[PDB]
């Protein structure tokens, strides 16, 4: 069996797996009030991609396909292709096209289009609301709100690049996005299918450890916290190595590379998430000046040193 | 001594190291007419970063810092911080802040900003012309043209997210952007310093192999071809592995995973670029349905099988 290992990039050098932005810190705290069931950034330690997880760090929350204008509006329907411009088959055993956003919110970006007959191009500000009834990526159908009613052509390659998130209206601040609320991938009133399982700490005295970024804000007072279970580089590495899991739990160590100091301990679970010995109702934030180091296989009953 | 190896992800699954977009194909042809000296995606096989190359795949052509409004216009000057929000040190032996664009052109994107008191956010269309006289990233200053003259606060975290290239100089002309023309990093009428060296084929009967993407176009008729010398995932891998080079040339083989067939042979050079045995005046484009496999170190005298 090939020896298991973990990338030696520092957290500061790695990418969020749920939005194309760099990681900024670590986060642990109580998640009892939420169902922690993200679909992107899900991968087993022996290399099985789950949920809607694909391998490109920039193909996250991106959309590709062709667009159809909705008359009397500045809204466009995108008939979806897969992230590599293959036909999207709605019968594949996945919740949605790979890389589909896994949280409810209004994601702002740009719609770009190239006409293949002469290489003419255009770009427009666009917003997609993954909570709207017409958000149905599992059916191959997504609606975008743009600033034009005419400039986009049918049957031409179109790409959505995400930039950030917005909050609107006179409602409470940071009410939106809701990073732990999965969208209805098939539209209003449908059940999601083939989901990566929800995760929660099991051994008592432990809590989940999150790899956290801050989504750029484009308008309003949004909740820009975005926690992921594995860095996108870890997803790429486990898939490549596919090292057999000698046990259910890999013991990792957080090491500052300049001092060599060990700063805390944690458990990497075979199904692809991390728990630490952190307790209580407050949150603990950890600067990103460290890398993870695999030291030995253990079981779920190993007792971690509180961090 | 650690054995050398290259990631096993197919080209389709890897990211361009000169812009945050996926790789789409391989490209080889005569390039003696150009000076091939990109500063991003520059890394030796034992993991020494060169030029302005950093490790994040999403922090390429991004800028971070605070902005000062240029009165009487919709333009802003961004006083730069490093990509990790540290004070930029212009006395570092680098050509420009790590991740700076390494080509002359008009790059379109969005400027987002967060006010640290109340968490209010804002985003605006923005273009940076890397050929402009006030494009002086090495001095810590870059200028953006936006769509506002008021809605940006001073001394607040501001980020530029790139989306694509535009084109409004020679209109239908495919004369811009110019991917093999370095900016004047210190501004108009200055000379660049600490460049990663230019590359060219040395062995008779050989040409450079490029990892090619197509940049999104946002306006006009831009030249969207973008060739990098190494996938950003290879830069990441070499930096972590840091395996000693037993020879100046690693022999790789391009293999289609679905079949196991070798499609061609190539030399990976210690300094961080690839050459193949190909010598027409015609270009050759290769679909990205294959990965690279390190087979053995060889000398510069090795004769590759033609393609």
């Amino acid at each position: 069996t090939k020896p298991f290992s973990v990338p030696v990039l520092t957290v500061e050098e790695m990418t969020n797996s749920r939005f194309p932005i760099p990681l900024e810190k670590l986060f642990t705290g109580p998640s009892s009030a939420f169902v922690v069931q993200p679909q992107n950034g899900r991968c087993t330690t022996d290399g099985v991609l789950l949920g809607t997880t694909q391998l490109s760090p920039v193909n996250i929350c991106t959309f590709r396909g062709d667009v159809t204008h909705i008359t009397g509006s500045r809204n466009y329907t995108m008939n979806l292709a897969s992230q590599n411009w293959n036909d999207y088959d709605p019968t594949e055993e996945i919740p949605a096209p790979l890389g589909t956003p896994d949280f409810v919110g209004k994601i702002q970006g740009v719609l770009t289009q190239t006409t293949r007959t002469d290489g003419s191009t255009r770009g427009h500000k666009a917003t997609v609301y993954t909570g709207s009834a017409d958000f149905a990526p599992k059916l191959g159908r997504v609606q975008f709100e743009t600033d034009t009613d005419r400039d986009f052509e049918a049957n031409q390659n179109t790409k959505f690049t995400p930039v950030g998130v917005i909050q609107d209206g006179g409602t409470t601040h940071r009410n939106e996005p809701q990073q732990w609320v999965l969208p209805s991938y098939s539209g209003r009133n449908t059940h999601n299918v083939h989901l990566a399982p929800a995760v929660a700490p099991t051994f008592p005295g432990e809590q989940l450890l999150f790899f956290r970024s801050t989504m750029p804000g484009c308008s309003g007072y949004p909740n820009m916290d975005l926690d992921c279970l594995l860095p996108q580089e870890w997803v790429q590495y486990f898939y490549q190595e596919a090292a057999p899991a000698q046990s259910d739990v890999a013991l990792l160590r957080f090491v500052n590379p300049d001092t060599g100091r060990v700063l805390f301990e944690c458990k990497l679970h075979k199904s692809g998430y991390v728990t630490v010995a952190h307790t209580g109702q407050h949150d603990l934030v950890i600067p990103p000046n460290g890398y993870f180091r695999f030291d030995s296989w253990v079981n779920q009953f190993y007792t971690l040193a509180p961090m | 001594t650690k054995p050398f190896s290259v990631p096993v992800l197919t080209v389709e699954e890897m990211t361009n190291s000169r812009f945050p977009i996926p790789l789409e194909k391989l490209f080889t042809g005569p390039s003696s007419a150009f000076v091939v000296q990109p500063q991003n995606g520059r890394c030796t096989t034992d993991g020494v970063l060169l030029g302005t190359t950093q490790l994040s795949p999403v922090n390429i052509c991004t800028f971070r810092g605070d902005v000062t409004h240029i009165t009487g216009s919709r333009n802003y000057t961004m006083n730069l911080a490093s990509q990790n929000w540290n004070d930029y040190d212009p006395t570092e032996e680098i050509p420009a802040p790590l991740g700076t664009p390494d080509f002359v052109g008009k790059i379109q994107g969005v400027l987002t900003q967060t006010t640290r008191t109340d968490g209010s956010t804002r985003g605006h269309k923005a273009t940076v012309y890397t050929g402009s006289a006030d494009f002086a990233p090495k001095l810590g200053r870059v200028q953006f043209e936006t769509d506002t003259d008021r809605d940006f606060e001073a001394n607040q975290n501001t980020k530029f997210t790139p989306v694509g290239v535009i084109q409004d100089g020679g209109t239908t002309h495919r004369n811009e952007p110019q991917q093999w023309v370095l900016p004047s990093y210190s501004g108009r009428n200055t000379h660049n310093v600490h460049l990663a060296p230019a590359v060219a084929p040395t062995f008779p009967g050989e040409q450079l192999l490029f990892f090619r993407s197509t940049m999104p176009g946002c306006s006009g008729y831009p030249n969207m071809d973008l060739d990098c010398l190494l996938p950003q995932e290879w830069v990441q891998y070499f930096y972590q592995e840091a395996a000693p080079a037993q020879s100046d040339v690693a022999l790789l083989r391009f293999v289609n995973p679905d079949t196991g067939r070798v499609l061609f042979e190539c030399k990976l050079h210690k300094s961080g670029y690839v050459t193949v045995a190909h010598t027409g005046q015609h270009d050759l484009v290769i679909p990205p349905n294959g990965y690279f496999r390190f087979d053995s170190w060889v000398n510069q005298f090795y004769t590759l099988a033609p393609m």
Epitope: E24, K25, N256, D258, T259, L263, H278, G280, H282, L284, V285, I286, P287, P288, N289, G290, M307 | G65, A81, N84, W85, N86, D87, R116, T117, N155, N157
Partner: nanobody, 129 residues
Framework: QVQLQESGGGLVQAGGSLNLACVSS????????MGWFRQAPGKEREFVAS????????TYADSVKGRFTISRDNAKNTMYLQMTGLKPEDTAVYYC??????????????????????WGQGTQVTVSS
């Protein structure tokens, strides 16, 4: 989960010296960037000094450079501020603060108050002309 307690400092004549200390307690993490701030009645809180967890990078306000010295002892969970040449201008409450998001002593926003996430109740320094 975090309490910063600063001590030392009281009444000193113009020209004198003081030694402030700040002790960390609770669910803390050793890499947090930390600094000193001061606020006088009816005025705005202003930056004084900062230092990283490795004592690599020290930063001082222009109005205290040369006179003040920031120092950090992680094993004792204590930050220090040695003050000399005290003028009545330096009369204020002195607070120690800590930014859980950052570790670099060159973090470009290290002088902004709103970047720090944990604050002590402060110790009073009064310099008498």
């Amino acid at each position: 989960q975090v309490q910063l307690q600063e001590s030392g400092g009281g009444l000193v004549q113009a020209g004198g010296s003081l030694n402030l200390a700040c002790v960390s307690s609770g669910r803390t993490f050793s890499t947090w960037l930390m600094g000193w701030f001061r606020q006088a009645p009816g005025k705005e809180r202003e930056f004084v000094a900062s230092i990283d967890w490795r004592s690599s990078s020290t930063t001082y306000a222009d109005s205290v450079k040369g006179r003040f010295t920031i120092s950090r002892d992680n094993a004792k969970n204590t930050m220090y501020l040695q003050m000399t040449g005290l003028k009545p201008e330096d009369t204020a409450v002195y607070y120690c603060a800590s930014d859980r998001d950052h570790y670099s002593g060159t973090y470009y926003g290290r002088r902004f108050v709103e970047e720090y996430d944990y604050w002590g109740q402060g110790t009073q320094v009064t310099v008498s002309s």
